[PDB]
Amino acid sequence: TPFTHETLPADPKAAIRQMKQALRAQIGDVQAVFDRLSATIAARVAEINDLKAQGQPVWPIIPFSELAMGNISDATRAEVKRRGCAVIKGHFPREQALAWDQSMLDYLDKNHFDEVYKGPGDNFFGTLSASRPEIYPVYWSQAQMQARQSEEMALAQSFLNRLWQVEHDGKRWFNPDISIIYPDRIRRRPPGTTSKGLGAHTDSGALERWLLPAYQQVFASVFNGNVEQYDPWNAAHRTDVEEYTVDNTTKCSVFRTFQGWTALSDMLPGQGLLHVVPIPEAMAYILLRPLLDDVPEDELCGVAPGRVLPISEQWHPLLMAALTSIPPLEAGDSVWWHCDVIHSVAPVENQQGWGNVMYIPAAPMCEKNLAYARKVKAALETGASPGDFPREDYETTWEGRFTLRDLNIHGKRALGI
Ligand SMILES: [Fe+3]
Numbered sequence: 309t310p311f312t313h314e315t316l317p318a319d320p321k322a323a324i325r326q327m328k329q330a331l332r333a334q335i336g337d338v339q340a341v342f343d344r345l346s347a348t349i350a351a352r353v354a355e356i357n358d359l360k361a362q363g364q365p366v367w368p369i370i371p372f373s374e375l376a377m378g379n380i381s382d383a384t385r386a387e388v389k390r391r392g393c394a395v396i397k398g399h400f401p402r403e404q405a406l407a408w409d410q411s412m413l414d415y416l417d418k419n420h421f422d423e424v425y426k427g428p429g430d431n432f433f434g435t436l437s438a439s440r441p442e443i444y445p446v447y448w449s450q451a452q453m454q455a456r457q458s459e460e461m462a463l464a465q466s467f468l469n470r471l472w473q474v475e476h477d478g479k480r481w482f483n484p485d486i487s488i489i490y491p492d493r494i495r496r497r498p499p500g501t502t503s504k505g506l507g508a509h510t511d512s513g514a515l516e517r518w519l520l521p522a523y524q525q526v527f528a529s530v531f532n533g534n535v536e537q538y539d540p541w542n543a544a545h546r547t548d549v550e551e552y553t554v555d556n557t558t559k560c561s562v563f564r565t566f567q568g569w570t571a572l573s574d575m576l577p578g579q580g581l582l583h584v585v586p587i588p589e590a591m592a593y594i595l596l597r598p599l600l601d602d603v604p605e606d607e608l609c610g611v612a613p614g615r616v617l618p619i620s621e622q623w624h625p626l627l628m629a630a631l632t633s634i635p636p637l638e639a640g641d642s643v644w645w646h647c648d649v650i651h652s653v654a655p656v657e658n659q660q661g662w663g664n665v666m667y668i669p670a671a672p673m674c675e676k677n678l679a680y681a682r683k684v685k686a687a688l689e690t691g692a693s694p695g696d697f698p699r700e701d702y703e704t705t706w707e708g709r710f711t712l713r714d715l716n717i718h719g720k721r722a723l724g725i
Pocket of ligand 1: 510511651
């Protein structure tokens with residue numbers, strides 16, 4: 309269309325305007341489609357609420373033993389697809405997790421982190437009420453890389469990728485059985501912590517969801533009214549997207565089937581825990597909401613370039629009605645959500661125990677993810693901040709960092725070597 313942009317429009321408001329007009333036209337009665345969509349989603353909220361009342365976790369719980377032994381049922385596979393998230397209990401033995409956590413402590417301590425730390429290096433969350441989640445951003449601890457290349461991450465990554473339709477056109481969109489090392493940050497909250505949390509948002513692009521041609525491809529069924537034809541699990545064209553780049557701002561130049569993390573400490577109920585909207589199709593609602601006629605013509609319900617896409621009660625009351633907590637967790641567990649899934653971190657006052665996690669996603673091998681992987685390997689040598697992240701570069705100088713010679717067979721392959 310005349311309406312799309314592959315690079316960041318010089319005039320966002322102008323571009324948003326034209327996209328809206330083009331789209332209202334291509335859909336017909338937007339409000340009728342939104343209502344239909346909402347009835348399906350309202351019905352899911354009924355499911356979710358029902359389960360909550362019973363005493364169930366809403367998150368599919370999948371024991372790592374079954375995963376490891378290939379004995380996951382069809383019903384479970386199905387449930388993870390319905391819910392868009394999964395907990396892997398016992399992903400790692402508690403010992404191993406706790407020992408990792410301790411190595412983290414000493415790695416930070418021995419390189420004098422708390423002294424040196426200047427940031428946040430970034431303002432990715434300016435669109436959120438709770439925009440300050442508790443002190444990050446290191447990449448190359450032995451703990452992290454080990455978990456990343458660990459054989460039992462590989463099992464989980466592969467199992468997860470497998471949930472996506474891969475075949476479609478030109479036989480295969482990515483290889484679901486190798487995943488790249490995507491070095492990410494950590495989340496470290498000590499007992500006593502008080503925090504606003506992280507406000508509900510989705511990752512992997514904001515404005516580009518509407519304006520990028522690849523996303524017009526991905527969400528065709530949405531942007532043409534056949535909302536029910538739309539399949540969250542179809543990899544079609546996801547690997548053709550490339551997010552807009554904004555000076556020194558967090559972006560994600562990689563395709564992630566799931567985001568997740570591995571817990572380094574026990575997570576106790578109410579202690580400012582990860583919540584998710586377990587309805588991966590919600591993205592449809594996010595996409596149609598600004599098209600409705602109570603929203604200003606040049607606006608996308610808070611979306612701004614170089615900022616995470618915000619989800620709020622103001623614009624998305626139904627989706628907010630669906631927020632659900634992770635169950636309580638023991639160290640070594642790990643949690644996963646579909647890349648289009650709305651999520652947040654609840655606030656705590658005076659937190660019991662630690663709230664430590666390592667960020668490790670499933671990002672499957674493909675021409676796109678490999679391009680980034682080639683870049684990662686360069687960073688891993690120097691210890692610099694991976695390109696996708698603010699150039700803080702704290703570890704370039706540190707002792708006890710994971711290095712090139714310490715790689716797995718997995719690791720060498722995940723970085724394509
Ligand atoms: Fe997020």
